[PDB]
PDB file of all heavy atoms in Angstrom:
ATOM      1  N   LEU A   1       0.840  -1.192   0.000  1.00  0.00           N
ATOM      2  CA  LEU A   1       0.000   0.000   0.000  1.00  0.00           C
ATOM      3  C   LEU A   1       0.877   1.245   0.000  1.00  0.00           C
ATOM      4  O   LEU A   1       2.106   1.144   0.013  1.00  0.00           O
ATOM      5  CB  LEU A   1      -0.968   0.028   1.204  1.00  0.00           C
ATOM      6  CG  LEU A   1      -0.353   0.302   2.587  1.00  0.00           C
ATOM      7  CD1 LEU A   1      -1.452   0.571   3.600  1.00  0.00           C
ATOM      8  CD2 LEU A   1       0.508  -0.860   3.062  1.00  0.00           C
ATOM      9  N   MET A   2       0.250   2.410  -0.019  1.00  0.00           N
ATOM     10  CA  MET A   2       0.980   3.672   0.031  1.00  0.00           C
ATOM     11  C   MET A   2       1.174   4.107   1.474  1.00  0.00           C
ATOM     12  O   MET A   2       2.222   4.635   1.844  1.00  0.00           O
ATOM     13  CB  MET A   2       0.232   4.763  -0.741  1.00  0.00           C
ATOM     14  CG  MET A   2       0.162   4.520  -2.240  1.00  0.00           C
ATOM     15  SD  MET A   2      -0.750   5.812  -3.108  1.00  0.00           S
ATOM     16  CE  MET A   2      -2.378   5.620  -2.384  1.00  0.00           C
ATOM     17  N   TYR A   3       0.157   3.866   2.291  1.00  0.00           N
ATOM     18  CA  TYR A   3       0.189   4.240   3.701  1.00  0.00           C
ATOM     19  C   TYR A   3       0.859   3.159   4.544  1.00  0.00           C
ATOM     20  O   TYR A   3       0.348   2.777   5.598  1.00  0.00           O
ATOM     21  CB  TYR A   3      -1.232   4.499   4.210  1.00  0.00           C
ATOM     22  CG  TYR A   3      -1.862   5.753   3.647  1.00  0.00           C
ATOM     23  CD1 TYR A   3      -2.509   5.743   2.416  1.00  0.00           C
ATOM     24  CD2 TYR A   3      -1.809   6.950   4.349  1.00  0.00           C
ATOM     25  CE1 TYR A   3      -3.082   6.891   1.904  1.00  0.00           C
ATOM     26  CE2 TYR A   3      -2.379   8.101   3.843  1.00  0.00           C
ATOM     27  CZ  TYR A   3      -3.015   8.065   2.621  1.00  0.00           C
ATOM     28  OH  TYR A   3      -3.580   9.211   2.113  1.00  0.00           O
ATOM     29  N   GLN A   4       2.012   2.685   4.079  1.00  0.00           N
ATOM     30  CA  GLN A   4       2.768   1.660   4.795  1.00  0.00           C
ATOM     31  C   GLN A   4       3.202   2.172   6.158  1.00  0.00           C
ATOM     32  O   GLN A   4       3.217   1.425   7.138  1.00  0.00           O
ATOM     33  CB  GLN A   4       4.009   1.241   4.003  1.00  0.00           C
ATOM     34  CG  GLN A   4       3.704   0.539   2.692  1.00  0.00           C
ATOM     35  CD  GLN A   4       4.951   0.026   1.996  1.00  0.00           C
ATOM     36  OE1 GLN A   4       5.003  -0.049   0.771  1.00  0.00           O
ATOM     37  NE2 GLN A   4       5.959  -0.338   2.771  1.00  0.00           N
ATOM     38  N   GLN A   5       3.553   3.450   6.213  1.00  0.00           N
ATOM     39  CA  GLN A   5       4.045   4.045   7.441  1.00  0.00           C
ATOM     40  C   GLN A   5       2.914   4.679   8.232  1.00  0.00           C
ATOM     41  O   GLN A   5       2.427   5.757   7.887  1.00  0.00           O
ATOM     42  CB  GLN A   5       5.114   5.096   7.148  1.00  0.00           C
ATOM     43  CG  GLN A   5       6.317   4.545   6.407  1.00  0.00           C
ATOM     44  CD  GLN A   5       7.405   5.578   6.198  1.00  0.00           C
ATOM     45  OE1 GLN A   5       8.126   5.540   5.205  1.00  0.00           O
ATOM     46  NE2 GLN A   5       7.545   6.497   7.142  1.00  0.00           N
ATOM     47  N   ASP A   6       2.497   4.003   9.286  1.00  0.00           N
ATOM     48  CA  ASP A   6       1.477   4.533  10.178  1.00  0.00           C
ATOM     49  C   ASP A   6       2.112   4.807  11.536  1.00  0.00           C
ATOM     50  O   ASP A   6       3.335   4.921  11.631  1.00  0.00           O
ATOM     51  CB  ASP A   6       0.316   3.541  10.311  1.00  0.00           C
ATOM     52  CG  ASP A   6      -1.003   4.229  10.608  1.00  0.00           C
ATOM     53  OD1 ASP A   6      -1.195   4.694  11.748  1.00  0.00           O
ATOM     54  OD2 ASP A   6      -1.848   4.326   9.692  1.00  0.00           O
ATOM     55  N   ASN A   7       1.303   4.902  12.580  1.00  0.00           N
ATOM     56  CA  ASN A   7       1.829   5.132  13.915  1.00  0.00           C
ATOM     57  C   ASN A   7       1.748   3.857  14.737  1.00  0.00           C
ATOM     58  O   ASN A   7       0.663   3.338  15.006  1.00  0.00           O
ATOM     59  CB  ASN A   7       1.076   6.260  14.637  1.00  0.00           C
ATOM     60  CG  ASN A   7       1.313   7.624  14.014  1.00  0.00           C
ATOM     61  OD1 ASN A   7       2.308   8.290  14.308  1.00  0.00           O
ATOM     62  ND2 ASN A   7       0.388   8.066  13.177  1.00  0.00           N
ATOM     63  N   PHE A   8       2.905   3.353  15.117  1.00  0.00           N
ATOM     64  CA  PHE A   8       2.991   2.163  15.941  1.00  0.00           C
ATOM     65  C   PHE A   8       3.345   2.552  17.363  1.00  0.00           C
ATOM     66  O   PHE A   8       4.320   3.272  17.592  1.00  0.00           O
ATOM     67  CB  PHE A   8       4.043   1.196  15.390  1.00  0.00           C
ATOM     68  CG  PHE A   8       3.643   0.519  14.106  1.00  0.00           C
ATOM     69  CD1 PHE A   8       3.580   1.230  12.918  1.00  0.00           C
ATOM     70  CD2 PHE A   8       3.342  -0.833  14.090  1.00  0.00           C
ATOM     71  CE1 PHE A   8       3.222   0.603  11.740  1.00  0.00           C
ATOM     72  CE2 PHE A   8       2.983  -1.463  12.914  1.00  0.00           C
ATOM     73  CZ  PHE A   8       2.923  -0.743  11.737  1.00  0.00           C
ATOM     74  N   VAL A   9       2.552   2.091  18.314  1.00  0.00           N
ATOM     75  CA  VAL A   9       2.832   2.348  19.710  1.00  0.00           C
ATOM     76  C   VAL A   9       3.775   1.273  20.222  1.00  0.00           C
ATOM     77  O   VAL A   9       3.364   0.146  20.504  1.00  0.00           O
ATOM     78  CB  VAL A   9       1.553   2.377  20.568  1.00  0.00           C
ATOM     79  CG1 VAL A   9       1.869   2.825  21.989  1.00  0.00           C
ATOM     80  CG2 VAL A   9       0.506   3.281  19.937  1.00  0.00           C
ATOM     81  N   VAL A  10       5.043   1.621  20.296  1.00  0.00           N
ATOM     82  CA  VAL A  10       6.072   0.672  20.668  1.00  0.00           C
ATOM     83  C   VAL A  10       6.352   0.735  22.159  1.00  0.00           C
ATOM     84  O   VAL A  10       6.677   1.796  22.701  1.00  0.00           O
ATOM     85  CB  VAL A  10       7.369   0.935  19.882  1.00  0.00           C
ATOM     86  CG1 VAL A  10       8.476  -0.017  20.313  1.00  0.00           C
ATOM     87  CG2 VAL A  10       7.110   0.807  18.391  1.00  0.00           C
ATOM     88  N   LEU A  11       6.218  -0.402  22.815  1.00  0.00           N
ATOM     89  CA  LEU A  11       6.434  -0.492  24.243  1.00  0.00           C
ATOM     90  C   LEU A  11       7.807  -1.085  24.529  1.00  0.00           C
ATOM     91  O   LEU A  11       8.018  -2.295  24.401  1.00  0.00           O
ATOM     92  CB  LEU A  11       5.341  -1.347  24.894  1.00  0.00           C
ATOM     93  CG  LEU A  11       3.900  -0.910  24.596  1.00  0.00           C
ATOM     94  CD1 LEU A  11       2.905  -1.864  25.238  1.00  0.00           C
ATOM     95  CD2 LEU A  11       3.655   0.508  25.084  1.00  0.00           C
ATOM     96  N   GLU A  12       8.746  -0.223  24.884  1.00  0.00           N
ATOM     97  CA  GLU A  12      10.081  -0.657  25.252  1.00  0.00           C
ATOM     98  C   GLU A  12      10.133  -0.801  26.766  1.00  0.00           C
ATOM     99  O   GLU A  12       9.405  -0.111  27.478  1.00  0.00           O
ATOM    100  CB  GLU A  12      11.114   0.369  24.764  1.00  0.00           C
ATOM    101  CG  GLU A  12      12.420  -0.228  24.245  1.00  0.00           C
ATOM    102  CD  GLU A  12      13.249  -0.907  25.316  1.00  0.00           C
ATOM    103  OE1 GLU A  12      13.525  -0.275  26.354  1.00  0.00           O
ATOM    104  OE2 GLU A  12      13.646  -2.071  25.118  1.00  0.00           O
ATOM    105  N   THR A  13      10.979  -1.693  27.256  1.00  0.00           N
ATOM    106  CA  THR A  13      11.083  -1.930  28.688  1.00  0.00           C
ATOM    107  C   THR A  13      11.599  -0.677  29.411  1.00  0.00           C
ATOM    108  O   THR A  13      11.368  -0.491  30.607  1.00  0.00           O
ATOM    109  CB  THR A  13      12.003  -3.133  28.972  1.00  0.00           C
ATOM    110  OG1 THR A  13      11.627  -4.237  28.132  1.00  0.00           O
ATOM    111  CG2 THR A  13      11.914  -3.564  30.430  1.00  0.00           C
ATOM    112  N   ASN A  14      12.292   0.186  28.674  1.00  0.00           N
ATOM    113  CA  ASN A  14      12.768   1.451  29.218  1.00  0.00           C
ATOM    114  C   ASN A  14      11.843   2.595  28.815  1.00  0.00           C
ATOM    115  O   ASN A  14      11.468   3.418  29.649  1.00  0.00           O
ATOM    116  CB  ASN A  14      14.193   1.749  28.743  1.00  0.00           C
ATOM    117  CG  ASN A  14      15.197   0.725  29.234  1.00  0.00           C
ATOM    118  OD1 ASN A  14      15.798   0.885  30.297  1.00  0.00           O
ATOM    119  ND2 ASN A  14      15.384  -0.336  28.466  1.00  0.00           N
ATOM    120  N   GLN A  15      11.467   2.636  27.539  1.00  0.00           N
ATOM    121  CA  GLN A  15      10.600   3.701  27.034  1.00  0.00           C
ATOM    122  C   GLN A  15       9.284   3.158  26.485  1.00  0.00           C
ATOM    123  O   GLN A  15       9.184   2.796  25.309  1.00  0.00           O
ATOM    124  CB  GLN A  15      11.307   4.526  25.960  1.00  0.00           C
ATOM    125  CG  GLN A  15      12.170   5.642  26.525  1.00  0.00           C
ATOM    126  CD  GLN A  15      11.402   6.519  27.498  1.00  0.00           C
ATOM    127  OE1 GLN A  15      11.427   6.295  28.711  1.00  0.00           O
ATOM    128  NE2 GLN A  15      10.688   7.499  26.974  1.00  0.00           N
ATOM    129  N   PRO A  16       8.264   3.076  27.348  1.00  0.00           N
ATOM    130  CA  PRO A  16       6.918   2.652  26.971  1.00  0.00           C
ATOM    131  C   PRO A  16       6.088   3.797  26.401  1.00  0.00           C
ATOM    132  O   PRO A  16       6.394   4.969  26.636  1.00  0.00           O
ATOM    133  CB  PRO A  16       6.306   2.186  28.302  1.00  0.00           C
ATOM    134  CG  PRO A  16       7.373   2.355  29.338  1.00  0.00           C
ATOM    135  CD  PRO A  16       8.335   3.359  28.781  1.00  0.00           C
ATOM    136  N   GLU A  17       5.039   3.440  25.658  1.00  0.00           N
ATOM    137  CA  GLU A  17       4.080   4.405  25.113  1.00  0.00           C
ATOM    138  C   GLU A  17       4.789   5.454  24.257  1.00  0.00           C
ATOM    139  O   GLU A  17       4.986   6.595  24.681  1.00  0.00           O
ATOM    140  CB  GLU A  17       3.285   5.061  26.253  1.00  0.00           C
ATOM    141  CG  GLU A  17       1.833   5.378  25.910  1.00  0.00           C
ATOM    142  CD  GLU A  17       1.677   6.519  24.924  1.00  0.00           C
ATOM    143  OE1 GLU A  17       1.669   6.259  23.708  1.00  0.00           O
ATOM    144  OE2 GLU A  17       1.551   7.684  25.366  1.00  0.00           O
ATOM    145  N   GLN A  18       5.194   5.049  23.062  1.00  0.00           N
ATOM    146  CA  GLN A  18       5.890   5.937  22.138  1.00  0.00           C
ATOM    147  C   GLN A  18       5.306   5.790  20.738  1.00  0.00           C
ATOM    148  O   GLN A  18       5.019   4.672  20.302  1.00  0.00           O
ATOM    149  CB  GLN A  18       7.390   5.609  22.114  1.00  0.00           C
ATOM    150  CG  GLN A  18       8.105   5.884  23.428  1.00  0.00           C
ATOM    151  CD  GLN A  18       8.275   7.365  23.706  1.00  0.00           C
ATOM    152  OE1 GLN A  18       8.415   8.169  22.786  1.00  0.00           O
ATOM    153  NE2 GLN A  18       8.265   7.737  24.974  1.00  0.00           N
ATOM    154  N   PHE A  19       5.123   6.906  20.038  1.00  0.00           N
ATOM    155  CA  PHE A  19       4.580   6.873  18.686  1.00  0.00           C
ATOM    156  C   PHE A  19       5.683   7.020  17.645  1.00  0.00           C
ATOM    157  O   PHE A  19       6.331   8.066  17.547  1.00  0.00           O
ATOM    158  CB  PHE A  19       3.545   7.985  18.474  1.00  0.00           C
ATOM    159  CG  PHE A  19       2.289   7.832  19.282  1.00  0.00           C
ATOM    160  CD1 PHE A  19       2.055   8.642  20.380  1.00  0.00           C
ATOM    161  CD2 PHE A  19       1.333   6.893  18.934  1.00  0.00           C
ATOM    162  CE1 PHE A  19       0.894   8.516  21.117  1.00  0.00           C
ATOM    163  CE2 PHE A  19       0.170   6.763  19.665  1.00  0.00           C
ATOM    164  CZ  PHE A  19      -0.049   7.575  20.759  1.00  0.00           C
ATOM    165  N   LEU A  20       5.888   5.971  16.869  1.00  0.00           N
ATOM    166  CA  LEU A  20       6.860   5.997  15.791  1.00  0.00           C
ATOM    167  C   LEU A  20       6.325   5.256  14.573  1.00  0.00           C
ATOM    168  O   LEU A  20       5.427   4.423  14.687  1.00  0.00           O
ATOM    169  CB  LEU A  20       8.209   5.415  16.237  1.00  0.00           C
ATOM    170  CG  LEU A  20       8.160   4.072  16.971  1.00  0.00           C
ATOM    171  CD1 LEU A  20       9.479   3.333  16.805  1.00  0.00           C
ATOM    172  CD2 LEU A  20       7.874   4.284  18.451  1.00  0.00           C
ATOM    173  N   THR A  21       6.871   5.579  13.411  1.00  0.00           N
ATOM    174  CA  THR A  21       6.400   5.002  12.162  1.00  0.00           C
ATOM    175  C   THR A  21       6.991   3.617  11.923  1.00  0.00           C
ATOM    176  O   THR A  21       7.875   3.167  12.656  1.00  0.00           O
ATOM    177  CB  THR A  21       6.740   5.908  10.962  1.00  0.00           C
ATOM    178  OG1 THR A  21       8.143   6.189  10.937  1.00  0.00           O
ATOM    179  CG2 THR A  21       5.958   7.210  11.023  1.00  0.00           C
ATOM    180  N   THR A  22       6.498   2.962  10.880  1.00  0.00           N
ATOM    181  CA  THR A  22       6.943   1.632  10.498  1.00  0.00           C
ATOM    182  C   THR A  22       8.460   1.576  10.294  1.00  0.00           C
ATOM    183  O   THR A  22       9.108   0.603  10.673  1.00  0.00           O
ATOM    184  CB  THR A  22       6.238   1.200   9.202  1.00  0.00           C
ATOM    185  OG1 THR A  22       4.884   1.676   9.221  1.00  0.00           O
ATOM    186  CG2 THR A  22       6.241  -0.313   9.051  1.00  0.00           C
ATOM    187  N   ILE A  23       9.023   2.632   9.714  1.00  0.00           N
ATOM    188  CA  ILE A  23      10.458   2.683   9.440  1.00  0.00           C
ATOM    189  C   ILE A  23      11.252   2.812  10.738  1.00  0.00           C
ATOM    190  O   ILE A  23      12.288   2.170  10.913  1.00  0.00           O
ATOM    191  CB  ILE A  23      10.811   3.858   8.500  1.00  0.00           C
ATOM    192  CG1 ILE A  23      10.098   3.692   7.155  1.00  0.00           C
ATOM    193  CG2 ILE A  23      12.318   3.963   8.294  1.00  0.00           C
ATOM    194  CD1 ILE A  23      10.430   2.401   6.435  1.00  0.00           C
ATOM    195  N   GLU A  24      10.747   3.631  11.649  1.00  0.00           N
ATOM    196  CA  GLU A  24      11.394   3.828  12.935  1.00  0.00           C
ATOM    197  C   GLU A  24      11.344   2.540  13.752  1.00  0.00           C
ATOM    198  O   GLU A  24      12.308   2.181  14.427  1.00  0.00           O
ATOM    199  CB  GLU A  24      10.713   4.967  13.688  1.00  0.00           C
ATOM    200  CG  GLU A  24      10.751   6.288  12.938  1.00  0.00           C
ATOM    201  CD  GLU A  24       9.919   7.363  13.601  1.00  0.00           C
ATOM    202  OE1 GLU A  24      10.429   8.035  14.518  1.00  0.00           O
ATOM    203  OE2 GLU A  24       8.748   7.542  13.202  1.00  0.00           O
ATOM    204  N   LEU A  25      10.210   1.850  13.677  1.00  0.00           N
ATOM    205  CA  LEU A  25      10.053   0.547  14.312  1.00  0.00           C
ATOM    206  C   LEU A  25      11.015  -0.462  13.691  1.00  0.00           C
ATOM    207  O   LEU A  25      11.673  -1.227  14.398  1.00  0.00           O
ATOM    208  CB  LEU A  25       8.605   0.064  14.169  1.00  0.00           C
ATOM    209  CG  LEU A  25       8.331  -1.358  14.662  1.00  0.00           C
ATOM    210  CD1 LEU A  25       8.652  -1.494  16.142  1.00  0.00           C
ATOM    211  CD2 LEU A  25       6.885  -1.732  14.390  1.00  0.00           C
ATOM    212  N   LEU A  26      11.096  -0.439  12.363  1.00  0.00           N
ATOM    213  CA  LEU A  26      12.002  -1.303  11.618  1.00  0.00           C
ATOM    214  C   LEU A  26      13.433  -1.130  12.111  1.00  0.00           C
ATOM    215  O   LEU A  26      14.113  -2.109  12.409  1.00  0.00           O
ATOM    216  CB  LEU A  26      11.924  -0.980  10.121  1.00  0.00           C
ATOM    217  CG  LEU A  26      11.461  -2.127   9.223  1.00  0.00           C
ATOM    218  CD1 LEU A  26      11.301  -1.644   7.789  1.00  0.00           C
ATOM    219  CD2 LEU A  26      12.445  -3.282   9.289  1.00  0.00           C
ATOM    220  N   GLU A  27      13.866   0.125  12.212  1.00  0.00           N
ATOM    221  CA  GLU A  27      15.211   0.457  12.677  1.00  0.00           C
ATOM    222  C   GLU A  27      15.492  -0.111  14.066  1.00  0.00           C
ATOM    223  O   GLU A  27      16.594  -0.590  14.334  1.00  0.00           O
ATOM    224  CB  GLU A  27      15.410   1.974  12.686  1.00  0.00           C
ATOM    225  CG  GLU A  27      15.652   2.562  11.307  1.00  0.00           C
ATOM    226  CD  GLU A  27      17.050   2.272  10.793  1.00  0.00           C
ATOM    227  OE1 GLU A  27      17.300   1.154  10.306  1.00  0.00           O
ATOM    228  OE2 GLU A  27      17.911   3.171  10.875  1.00  0.00           O
ATOM    229  N   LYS A  28      14.502  -0.059  14.948  1.00  0.00           N
ATOM    230  CA  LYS A  28      14.669  -0.610  16.287  1.00  0.00           C
ATOM    231  C   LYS A  28      14.783  -2.128  16.227  1.00  0.00           C
ATOM    232  O   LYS A  28      15.673  -2.716  16.844  1.00  0.00           O
ATOM    233  CB  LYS A  28      13.511  -0.208  17.208  1.00  0.00           C
ATOM    234  CG  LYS A  28      13.420   1.290  17.469  1.00  0.00           C
ATOM    235  CD  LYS A  28      12.619   1.586  18.728  1.00  0.00           C
ATOM    236  CE  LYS A  28      12.547   3.080  19.004  1.00  0.00           C
ATOM    237  NZ  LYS A  28      12.068   3.368  20.383  1.00  0.00           N
ATOM    238  N   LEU A  29      13.895  -2.752  15.459  1.00  0.00           N
ATOM    239  CA  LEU A  29      13.877  -4.203  15.326  1.00  0.00           C
ATOM    240  C   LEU A  29      15.160  -4.731  14.695  1.00  0.00           C
ATOM    241  O   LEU A  29      15.809  -5.597  15.252  1.00  0.00           O
ATOM    242  CB  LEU A  29      12.665  -4.659  14.512  1.00  0.00           C
ATOM    243  CG  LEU A  29      11.351  -4.722  15.288  1.00  0.00           C
ATOM    244  CD1 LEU A  29      10.205  -5.078  14.357  1.00  0.00           C
ATOM    245  CD2 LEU A  29      11.455  -5.736  16.420  1.00  0.00           C
ATOM    246  N   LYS A  30      15.548  -4.194  13.545  1.00  0.00           N
ATOM    247  CA  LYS A  30      16.732  -4.696  12.849  1.00  0.00           C
ATOM    248  C   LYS A  30      17.993  -4.547  13.707  1.00  0.00           C
ATOM    249  O   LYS A  30      18.958  -5.287  13.532  1.00  0.00           O
ATOM    250  CB  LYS A  30      16.904  -4.006  11.490  1.00  0.00           C
ATOM    251  CG  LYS A  30      16.908  -2.487  11.551  1.00  0.00           C
ATOM    252  CD  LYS A  30      16.708  -1.878  10.170  1.00  0.00           C
ATOM    253  CE  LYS A  30      17.998  -1.860   9.369  1.00  0.00           C
ATOM    254  NZ  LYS A  30      18.995  -0.931   9.956  1.00  0.00           N
ATOM    255  N   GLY A  31      17.966  -3.608  14.647  1.00  0.00           N
ATOM    256  CA  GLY A  31      19.081  -3.440  15.559  1.00  0.00           C
ATOM    257  C   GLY A  31      19.120  -4.521  16.627  1.00  0.00           C
ATOM    258  O   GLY A  31      20.157  -5.147  16.864  1.00  0.00           O
ATOM    259  N   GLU A  32      17.993  -4.762  17.273  1.00  0.00           N
ATOM    260  CA  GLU A  32      17.944  -5.772  18.312  1.00  0.00           C
ATOM    261  C   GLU A  32      18.011  -7.172  17.699  1.00  0.00           C
ATOM    262  O   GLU A  32      18.662  -8.059  18.242  1.00  0.00           O
ATOM    263  CB  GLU A  32      16.709  -5.581  19.205  1.00  0.00           C
ATOM    264  CG  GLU A  32      15.381  -5.540  18.471  1.00  0.00           C
ATOM    265  CD  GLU A  32      14.825  -6.918  18.188  1.00  0.00           C
ATOM    266  OE1 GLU A  32      14.903  -7.779  19.085  1.00  0.00           O
ATOM    267  OE2 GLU A  32      14.308  -7.135  17.075  1.00  0.00           O
ATOM    268  N   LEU A  33      17.389  -7.335  16.540  1.00  0.00           N
ATOM    269  CA  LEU A  33      17.359  -8.614  15.842  1.00  0.00           C
ATOM    270  C   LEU A  33      18.754  -9.025  15.378  1.00  0.00           C
ATOM    271  O   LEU A  33      19.091 -10.209  15.390  1.00  0.00           O
ATOM    272  CB  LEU A  33      16.406  -8.540  14.647  1.00  0.00           C
ATOM    273  CG  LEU A  33      16.194  -9.852  13.894  1.00  0.00           C
ATOM    274  CD1 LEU A  33      15.567 -10.898  14.800  1.00  0.00           C
ATOM    275  CD2 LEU A  33      15.327  -9.623  12.670  1.00  0.00           C
ATOM    276  N   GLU A  34      19.569  -8.057  14.961  1.00  0.00           N
ATOM    277  CA  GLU A  34      20.939  -8.367  14.575  1.00  0.00           C
ATOM    278  C   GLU A  34      21.747  -8.761  15.808  1.00  0.00           C
ATOM    279  O   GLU A  34      22.703  -9.533  15.710  1.00  0.00           O
ATOM    280  CB  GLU A  34      21.616  -7.197  13.847  1.00  0.00           C
ATOM    281  CG  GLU A  34      21.859  -5.986  14.725  1.00  0.00           C
ATOM    282  CD  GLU A  34      22.735  -4.942  14.072  1.00  0.00           C
ATOM    283  OE1 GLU A  34      22.201  -4.062  13.369  1.00  0.00           O
ATOM    284  OE2 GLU A  34      23.966  -4.989  14.279  1.00  0.00           O
TER     285      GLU A  34
END
């Protein structure tokens, strides 16, 4: 789709309740996943 980037509420053990896009979430995941 075009609206691939929405607002994901990412709950981190240090920083809960945060609004970031799909790309920002991706960046967090690919970092921890690596």
Side-chain angles (χ1 to χ4, degrees):
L1 72 169
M2 293 179 297
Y3 290 85
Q4 294 185 210
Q5 301 184 212
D6 208 286
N7 292 276
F8 289 71
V9 187
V10 177
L11 306 177
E12 218 293 307
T13 312
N14 297 269
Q15 275 308 94
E17 215 289 89
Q18 294 288 329
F19 293 106
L20 48 155
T21 55
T22 323
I23 299 302
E24 301 172 85
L25 174 60
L26 241 175
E27 283 285 79
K28 296 200 179 194
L29 280 176
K30 53 195 279 293
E32 55 84 42
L33 185 62
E34 67 170 88

